[PDB]
Amino acid sequence: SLLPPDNEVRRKHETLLLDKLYDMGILSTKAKLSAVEHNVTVSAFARRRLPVVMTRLRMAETVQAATKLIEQGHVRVGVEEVRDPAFLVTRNMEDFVTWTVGSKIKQNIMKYRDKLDDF
Amino acid sequence: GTPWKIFKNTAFIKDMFNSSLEIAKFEGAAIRTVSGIRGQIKRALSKPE
């Protein structure tokens, strides 16, 4: 912001910082530097960690119990399993982080919703 | 008139006219039920004249 408003490099990095953080999900818009200033926050980081965002996608009831699940290891990302409960889920990966292969959890879900394929 | 059948929006109406001719004169007619629903007459219905 200290840079004078009319500059090319200012314009380029306003856009760059904004769209990059937005693709890291920590924001909510992509057009306001004041929002970067008094909005970008370690709390927003934590709410883009892994267990918090699996509560948001509704994997599990409370983010404590979500931590317990992903520590036992039912929670996959992409194609890998994940143990590190700080695997910062960027916005392109919130759509993917799902349940693992041989999970008693996934079979429980299929039990309740009555399709429980044993194959 | 008085409605003959009633679908969701489009309603047929029967006992208002004596001919398709009279209707197609009153094409696009600004019609209005008592309850205050507005509406429009659009085509004469063919099988009961």
Binding site: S1, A31, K32, L33, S34, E37, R91, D95 | -
Partner: protein, 297 residues
């Protein structure tokens, strides 16, 4: 995929509501910035909201750059506007009839990057699925009444806005024998638009003119053989498709080759074809008091 498109589309909605709040703000911010250059005094609330002044000092550059036209607004079109070629499919209704199928062939020809598709036995939810698994620009329907088309239904995919319009005054391609008509050129036609003077007019022109390929920009005003027109009066946009040869720097001759439409758009939804539970943006309001007096577009 499917969780992804649900993700992005709702994020578009929520960011719109965000833009509502912040543009209500920037209205005030606008008056501050103008005053600095002008030295004309200002509203005292604007003079003394402190977070506003500091936030000005951060967020100047957006306002001046928008004044410059340096950026195009956040849009379901601005992501991929003139970069990549929009491919478009045209489909008929469920059980088509033959004259309708010929007319659909005609408007496939008018577009240059299209395919037609026999609809056949296909749930329209799964036709939307075919869309979001072949990354189309645009689905397009047709509905006939009795041999004569009545309505088209433009959707912009992956998730964009949909126009839905009646048609009238249609002529086919196929009322003229092939001894006089002929195969029409698949060249990238120009587009012209006359009389769209609402912001809603610019919405509908946006959803129209992002159908066609990008022209190459070097000599486009000089080259080119084929011109498509959209003109509008009494919110009945009339569209013709013409082909031309330039006989002089002072004279030119046109030939009329496409189907002649008038369509009047009666549903514009930021929301695709299946989602009947979506947010409409302008519907055609008969039955009201002065829905006949006023016009949009």
């Amino acid at each position: 995929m499917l969780r992804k498109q649900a993700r992005q589309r709702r994020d578009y909605l929520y960011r719109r509501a965000l833009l509502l709040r912040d543009a209500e703000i920037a209205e005030k911010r606008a008056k501050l910035r103008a005053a600095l250059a002008s030295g004309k005094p200002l509203d005292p609330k604007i003079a003394n909201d402190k977070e506003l002044r500091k936030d000005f000092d951060y967020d100047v550059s957006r306002d001046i750059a928008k004044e410059q036209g340096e950026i195009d607004i956040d849009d379901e079109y601005s992501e991929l506007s003139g970069i990549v070629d929009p491919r478009v499919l045209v489909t008929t209704s469920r059980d088509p009839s033959s004259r309708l199928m010929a007319f659909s062939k005609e408007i496939r020809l008018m577009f240059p990057t299209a395919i037609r598709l026999n609809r056949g036995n296909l749930i329209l939810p799964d036709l939307v699925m075919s869309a979001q698994r072949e990354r189309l620009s645009d689905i397009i329907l047709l509905h006939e009444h009795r041999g004569t088309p009545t309505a088209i239904t433009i959707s912009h995919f992956p998730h964009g806005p949909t126009l839905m319009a009646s048609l009238h005054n249609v002529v086919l391609r196929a009322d003229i024998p092939k001894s006089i008509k002929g195969t029409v050129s698949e060249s990238y036609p120009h587009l012209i638009f006359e009389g769209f003077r609402t912001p809603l007019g610019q919405r509908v022109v946006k959803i129209l003119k992002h159908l066609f390929p990008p022209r190459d920009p070097t000599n486009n005003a000089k080259s080119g053989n084929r011109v498509i027109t959209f003109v509008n009066q009494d919110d009945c946009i009339e569209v013709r498709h013409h082909v031309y040869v330039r006989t002089n720097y002072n004279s030119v001759e046109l030939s009329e080759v496409g189907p002649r439409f008038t369509m009047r758009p009666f549903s514009i939804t930021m929301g695709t074809l299946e989602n009947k539970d979506a947010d409409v943006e302008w519907h055609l309001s008969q039955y009201t008091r002065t829905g006949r007096k006023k016009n949009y577009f």
